[PDB]
Amino acid sequence: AQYEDGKQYTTLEKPVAGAPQVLEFFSFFCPHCYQFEEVLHISDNVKKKLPEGVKMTKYHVNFMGGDLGKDLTQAWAVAMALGVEDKVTVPLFEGVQKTQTIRSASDIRDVFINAGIKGEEYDAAWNSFVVKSLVAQQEKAAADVQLRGVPAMFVNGKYQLNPQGMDTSNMDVFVQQYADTVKYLSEK
Numbered sequence: 001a002q003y004e005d006g007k008q009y010t011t012l013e014k015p016v017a018g019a020p021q022v023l024e025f026f027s028f029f030c031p032h033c034y035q036f037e038e039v040l041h042i043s044d045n046v047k048k049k050l051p052e053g054v055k056m057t058k059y060h061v062n063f064m065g066g067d068l069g070k071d072l073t074q075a076w077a078v079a080m081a082l083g084v085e086d087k088v089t090v091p092l093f094e095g096v097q098k099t100q101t102i103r104s105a106s107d108i109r110d111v112f113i114n115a116g117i118k119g120e121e122y123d124a125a126w127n128s129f130v131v132k133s134l135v136a137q138q139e140k141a142a143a144d145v146q147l148r149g150v151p152a153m154f155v156n157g158k159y160q161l162n163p164q165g166m167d168t169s170n171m172d173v174f175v176q177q178y179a180d181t182v183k184y185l186s187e188k
Contacts, residue, residue: 007165008181012158016144019157020057025142028072028096029065030150037093045179059138061150071105077134078125087115155185
């Protein structure tokens with residue numbers, strides 16, 4: 001067929017029940033993740049081709065960058081709780097991977113302050129039980145698919161995108177193939 005298990009995607013031997021429809025994992029320490037966000041705009045192009053009804057979830061992971069990695073997972077929880085993902089994603093990626101000015105939790109906090117979230121609002125969120133459970137959700141979702149690498153995308157808890165099996169000579173073409181695959185899996 002045109003879409004084949006083991007080619008544009010893989011199937012989980014252990015499907016995950018109750019999973020989000022489109023579930024994306026990343027790390028701010030992850031170089032392909034940087035590409036996916038600033039160069040390819042994968043999440044955005046996927047969304048543009050998803051049907052009616054389908055919500056998109058994006059979670060951070062702990063397994064890169066040690067202590068700072070966990071801080072970034074908690075900070076992404078803060079971003080989700082406040083709904084400010086679209087304001088901190090770029091400065092967080094660039095702070096970790098481009099300027100390398102993010103070296104501590106305080107430096108992460110600075111990114112949010114500069115993006116206009118108030119200190120009082122940031123610190124209250126950071127220390128909140130709502131953010132604690134949001135961390136738990138991110139960790140639990142990654143654990144459910146026994147996640148060992150990023151970027152990763154899973155559709156309906158049962159299909160895992162396989163980007164290595166797509167042509168990368170042209171970036172635009174890669175992105176649409178990726179997106180179209182997600183739509184296909186979506187309607188499966």
